[PDB]
Amino acid sequence: TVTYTNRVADARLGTFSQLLLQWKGSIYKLLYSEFLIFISLYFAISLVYRLILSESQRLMFEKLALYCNSYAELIPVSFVLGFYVSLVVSRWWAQYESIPWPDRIMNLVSCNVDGEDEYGRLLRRTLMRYSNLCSVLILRSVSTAVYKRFPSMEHVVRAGLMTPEEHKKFESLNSPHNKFWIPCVWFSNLAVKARNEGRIRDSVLLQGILNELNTLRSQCGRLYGYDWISIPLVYTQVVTVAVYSFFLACLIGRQFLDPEKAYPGHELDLFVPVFTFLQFFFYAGWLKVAEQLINPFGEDDDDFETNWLIDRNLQVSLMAVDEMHQDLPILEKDLYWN
Amino acid sequence: TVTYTNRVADARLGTFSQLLLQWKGSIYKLLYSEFLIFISLYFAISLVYRLILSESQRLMFEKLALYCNSYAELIPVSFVLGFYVSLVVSRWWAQYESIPWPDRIMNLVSCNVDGEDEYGRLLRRTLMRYSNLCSVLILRSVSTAVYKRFPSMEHVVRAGLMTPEEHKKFESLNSPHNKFWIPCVWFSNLAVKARNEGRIRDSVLLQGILNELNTLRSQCGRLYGYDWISIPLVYTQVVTVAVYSFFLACLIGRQFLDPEKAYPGHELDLFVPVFTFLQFFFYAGWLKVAEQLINPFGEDDDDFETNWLIDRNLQVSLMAVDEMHQDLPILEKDLYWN
Amino acid sequence: TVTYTNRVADARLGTFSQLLLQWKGSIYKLLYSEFLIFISLYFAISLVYRLILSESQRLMFEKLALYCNSYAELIPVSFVLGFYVSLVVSRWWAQYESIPWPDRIMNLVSCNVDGEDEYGRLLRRTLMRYSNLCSVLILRSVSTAVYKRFPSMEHVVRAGLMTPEEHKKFESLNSPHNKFWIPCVWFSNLAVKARNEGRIRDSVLLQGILNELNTLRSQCGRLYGYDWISIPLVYTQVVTVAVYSFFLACLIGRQFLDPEKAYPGHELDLFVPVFTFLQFFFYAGWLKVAEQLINPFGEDDDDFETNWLIDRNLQVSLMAVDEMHQDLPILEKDLYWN
Amino acid sequence: TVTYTNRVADARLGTFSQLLLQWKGSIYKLLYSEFLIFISLYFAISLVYRLILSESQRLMFEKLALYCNSYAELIPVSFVLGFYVSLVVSRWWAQYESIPWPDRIMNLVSCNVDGEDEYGRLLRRTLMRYSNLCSVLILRSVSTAVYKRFPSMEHVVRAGLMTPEEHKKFESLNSPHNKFWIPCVWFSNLAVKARNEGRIRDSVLLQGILNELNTLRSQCGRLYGYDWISIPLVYTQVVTVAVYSFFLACLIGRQFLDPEKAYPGHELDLFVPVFTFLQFFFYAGWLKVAEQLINPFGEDDDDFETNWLIDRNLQVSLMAVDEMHQDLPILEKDLYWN
Amino acid sequence: TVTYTNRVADARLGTFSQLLLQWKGSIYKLLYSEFLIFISLYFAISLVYRLILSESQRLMFEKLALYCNSYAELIPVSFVLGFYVSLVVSRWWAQYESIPWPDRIMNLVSCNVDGEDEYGRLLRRTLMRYSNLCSVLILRSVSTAVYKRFPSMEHVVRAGLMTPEEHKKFESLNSPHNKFWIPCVWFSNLAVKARNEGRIRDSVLLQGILNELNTLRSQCGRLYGYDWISIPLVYTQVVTVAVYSFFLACLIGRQFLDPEKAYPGHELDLFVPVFTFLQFFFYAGWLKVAEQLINPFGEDDDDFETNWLIDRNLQVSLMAVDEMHQDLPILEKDLYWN
Ligand SMILES: [Ca+2]
Ligand SMILES: [Ca+2]
Ligand SMILES: [Ca+2]
Ligand SMILES: [Ca+2]
Ligand SMILES: [Ca+2]
């Protein structure tokens, strides 16, 4: 994503006036193809009408242009497009919050799994690596950036997210469905094995660890649900037919007619319709935002930084349960004692 | 459902332009009947007006067409239809999330119910089969696809979801209401019987299993509530009268009149109203999406894949508590040790 | 409620076309009075204008009709009415989900309260009867159907929901406020008395039972809040003044004037305004849905089936803690063993 | 609040027609001042125009009235006002549900704090009085009705909500901020002191009591947040400038011009603009509802009955933990035994 | 923020009429620059047109002004701007509720961590200082006011929020990412160290403290998510291009033309367009509210008072676990005893 929050804290004058001077993740980069196609088609029809057509053929084109200008308002562009964009934005922010963060499981495993020797160290690192793997295996199914980072499971083995013994156990488990739920069972079995060996003191701490595991499992299930149940295809087809049909009508209807014929409405000849191009800018770019945000896990400039987030979660998770287990600062008095 | 999420990750040019070349679950398959009925009625009235009516009768039809063109805008089509479609889409996504997933109960039963012999194996499989049966018995009441897969309870017995002794116990329980709550009591009684025999260690683990049982029971209750309390019938009647009355008016009002009579507005004769057919496309198809999604558990192309989900839940549930109980990979060091 | 979900699973052709042939809970049954009053007033003014008024008086009525037709669009009908109907529908579905279901408490009491003799049987039945009574005493305060089923507390005694000793204890408790919270204290005291006698094993199971009791108490409190804090009366007055003032203006403005006077707009005389009657149909019926759903606990055709739900909850609750305590089917192998 | 829910259960004919015959909490009581000011200003300008101005001055007033009638539609009244009213209603119902109800803490304290002697009786009453005081001290900060009931802390002492020793301890605690969090710490300390003396059996019951304490603390924190973070003042200024500027324009633009001058639009002279007064009624009263509901804790007719609710909570809380501790009815058989 | 809730409790007459006489946090302070730029540009173009241009050049400017007045309505200002402002307000109130409040952790630590000597006092103060530091370290990353209060970590050391030993431990932990999660691991490790020394009695109280820690960690994670995932930049660019392009068109289109030329629409010459300036006021100020509230953690007049809240949380947290540990008032009888 493009983050500009620190630039818009106060509202002086050019709070939004400077942000339109940015190229990375802009409206200009999105509309740079469709806008130039629209410019090319409009100026092509304009030059053909001004330089090629005969007089009766121009007189027929005038009636066609008046018909298309009168009756292009029957197409419900804003009515369909606002509803579709509201769906896309609602599902967008709903899909951000479904991304699993390891930090609650991190806080519980960093303190409740005892042992300062190598066995408890290995145990805590294996628990957090299972919690991260149960996230990576669903993020490589819902995202294309993670899938291009990890094309096969051997790339998950080489990155250190999975040992080859876990790869052999993962391949030996026979299931035709998506196997993202495999480490979230290994986590619970390893937590119970840790409790039975005395590394976890009581049942309440074990049940807290398992509750946070099931919370992360619900997060991964929400990601699977938002990826599998898309926006219905019939909505996408209706909105693209709406925008493309409206501006296909505006290719003919918004053409500058002859001022010497003295039509009502077409009195000035400017050869560049500023308001038609602005209306195409707002409607077509308003559709392009929904095209960008309908899948926020791809490789757009404003899709989610999933690979960075995987690297952060792996580093922070393996940091807080290895170096920070019983490594506390010295309990000292504050500036407010007596 | 038709899933196209992997095709719309990035937004290059034809992100939505290729998706209108798809037939399965499209606007075209929905409107293929109503659109051709509208085309047939319009061209029938057009040919009758052009070839059959006498001159005074055509002059009366002209006044009828001008009246219907002037006063068809009084019908609040968009105002009623947007509100109705917003209800349908909100209830649609609310009904997806109410579908019970066994995975939290799966994670707890796979680890907390002890025993590697045949008795604990039978116990875990019976617990997960009760948790799946308490979902199947409500999905065959809210869906028509599951009801056509399982027409009677004997088909539930033959699929392995229920043993015949459980069928006899299920028939001996006398209740005139829906019996989907029967396995969700058997689960709690079998969990307490498992705790009393020592298969579950403490009370906290038992209460966690019962809390996830009650969570799945709340999911099934939400499905029962959304199926039983429909959208009010008066809304459905008002929206279908709105769309059908508006286009019944547009059968007469949008007719191309005679250009030689020189009416204001009807100057060009094209014999095919492109914008009337587009307006019928958007409004009527916008109603057809609500017709499709008012019950997302039927057998439309974009209703929910409930039978696939039942098969997945049964296979994954009986997999993770039988093969994956204490079958863990070897605890080995990572690529980040020292 | 009228349930039609099983009829609209697929979307073939007449998915909504058959549902307008139904009378029970329709738009026709709602508007059958107001629509005929509007028809009567319009045709009365029409016949008086056509047969009674003199020429200068008709000429004054023409100017009054043109004024009322020009200036009835200043009344914000859709703007106020859409906001009001959105409130009514949001509160409608929010009030359905606040109805207490005994099933979570049923699942916990059916398994955690021990004893196969008559004392534990009496104990479980008394606990579930308290949980049902704490729901009946708020449903007879928020609904008129339950209040007509149970006019006094003696009718609650005769139905078996309350023994006469509990009636005497309920009357001896002195409080000027609504006493729906009385059985939800008796439940907690009886659960603690059951724990102290050894019928409940540990504290965790008791706390789970009390947590589900407090969940049902929050459900009853939400019902009390939605009944006591209505939609503000000023909104109801503004919407009824809006609809009635707009169609009081349309009684005069939509009248067919004389075509021989040649007014702009009034050229055709049909004597039955189809689009005025349709506009009255949609706006007035859109108000009548809000009139129906502003209190969904009354005795409309599409209000909630509260009495049926009370009977179901009583039967299922006293069934699952009496016959189904330790009555489990035989643990047998599945079709997938080895 | 004005409650009319029992009057609108069914929808016969006059379901909303009788509710406009009510004065308490009506649109008429709100608009009785602003409407008469608008009537006075309009009729003043009308009589001055009809009786005082000369002919050229009337001819200038005609052009001013046509300008103001043509260009008053540029003011976005409905666009700003609908958004503002939606915020006010959303925050209104969000602030009702944040009002703390003592009933969950009541159910736990009435059963889990042991002792039938005077010490446990005093202990339970002191716990519930702390839970009520932690609500009263935030309701006298967010409401003006509670602040006029309790102007100082001595009025809280005289009402029995606080003993004078608790008043001295409350004054000895030095903090420049709002002290509504003081009894919600006393509750937890007294619950731990009750557990350490054996009045509470185990830790799980104590943690349940503390969890419901923190739930009530979150309710009080939501009330503090909704009172402290208002709707932004810039929205309130924009909506009042919108409504007042639009009807300041309509004082001149809606004036009946001279019919003998024969302007397009002003042909009939009625001297009382019915639709202008109706439009002022709906827009200005639609603003007055937001003025009423922007602070629903004041002393309007449809603000919340906070003092009644404080009296109810105090009476019910001190009732259910004193008289109803181990005072249960006799366990007797039902009408459905065998 | 500017709080005016106590001024708008009742609705008499001038409930909103007095609030437009306030300068701090008003629409006037926001629009004081852009409005004067618009006034300057409009009056500059007006004086140039009235005093400088020749007759044919004025005749060309008339056609340009009629074109820009006819075709500036094609720009979807309200359609884009309402959607954007709805996003800004929804995210605004969603970001207020994500601010962590220490009070639940305060209530649990003030009672469950035993010890009246200096060691338990130091232990409770260190726990609450960790809970406050885990909030300060994310509020100095999401806000500019806290970042200007604490430019470096030495300023956090000097304020008493962090001892220098904790500063050395905080710098020794090597991580390239944001370190706001560091004290929320120290809290859990210190709570487990407090439990193992006997300062916390059982496991249930420890798990309650850790659950409230993870709740505060989820609050800080929501703040990090709302700061990192902004509103998409393409929406901000489209709305600022919409407002600026519409009023750039209105600089030419709303100009008062010559009345002697007798154009339809431009008949009166007033030299100050009141309704154009009002329309600029509402649209441009409606954009400026979104500019103010897109980052509510900056230093605007109506952004959140974050520094005051940090000071309050520090004072109240270190107050309630030091002075109020076992300092209870005397248990005395109420006014309602017998
Ligand atoms: Ca994307
Ligand atoms: Ca369907
Ligand atoms: Ca009703
Ligand atoms: Ca108020
Ligand atoms: Ca700001």
Numbering used by the authors:
A (entry chain C), B (entry chain D), C (entry chain E), D (entry chain A), E (entry chain B): 2 to 339
What does the paper say about this structure?
BEST1-4 proteins are expressed in the plasma membrane and form Ca2+-activated Cl- channels by assembling as pentamers. The channel comprises five BEST1 subunits arranged symmetrically around a central ion pore that is ~95 Å long. The diameter of the pore varies along its length and contains two constrictions, the ‘neck’ and the ‘aperture’, both of which are lined by hydrophobic amino acids. To address these questions we determined a series of cryo-electron microscopy (cryo-EM) structures of chicken BEST1 with and without Ca2+ in activated, deactivated, and inactivated states that represent the major gating transitions of the channel.
In an aim to obtain structural information on an open conformation of the channel, we used a construct spanning amino acids 1–345 (termed BEST1345) for cryo-EM studies. Single particle cryo-EM analysis of Ca2+-bound BEST1345 revealed two distinct conformations of the channel. Based on discussions presented herein we conclude that this represents the open conformation of the channel. In the open conformation, the neck has dilated to approximately 13 Å in diameter, which is more than sufficient to allow permeation of hydrated Cl- ions. Conformational changes in the helices that form the walls of the neck (the S2b ‘neck’ helices from each of the five subunits) underlie opening. The conformational change moves F80 and F84 away from the center of the pore and involves rotation of the neck helix along its helical axis (~15 ° clockwise viewed from the extracellular side) and outward displacement of the neck helix that is more pronounced on its N-terminal end (~2.5 Å at F80). When the channel opens, the first α-helical turn of the neck helix unravels such that I76 packs with F247, F276, L279 and F283 in the open conformation and has shifted by approximately 10 Å. The repositioning within the neck also exposes the hydrophilic residues S79 and G83 on the neck helix, which had been secluded behind the F80 and F84, to the pore in its open conformation.
